[PDB]
Symmetry: C4
Subunit: 25 residues, 4 copies
């Protein structure tokens, strides 16, 4: 459920925050 | 609509950060 | 809802399929 | 649990394709 779903989405958004640093921004 | 809509919006957010990546590359 | 949520997730997965081609794979 | 679980699994899928990107870079 919902809470768990959201929580994935934060962890997706942490992965993407590292990704965009590794790239030029 | 709640946690549902926050889930929506954060998906869009993710789609937007991905389309920005894709265009950068 | 659910269906709409999923559908975002396919469109995330199309963005990522283009991304991984643009990169070395 | 249904569409719920498919949503789960495809999140994980996405997290996994992102962690593979992150490690590539």
């Amino acid at each position: 459920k919902t809470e768990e779903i959201l929580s994935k989405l934060y962890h997706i958004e942490n992965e993407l925050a590292r990704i965009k640093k590794l790239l030029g921004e």
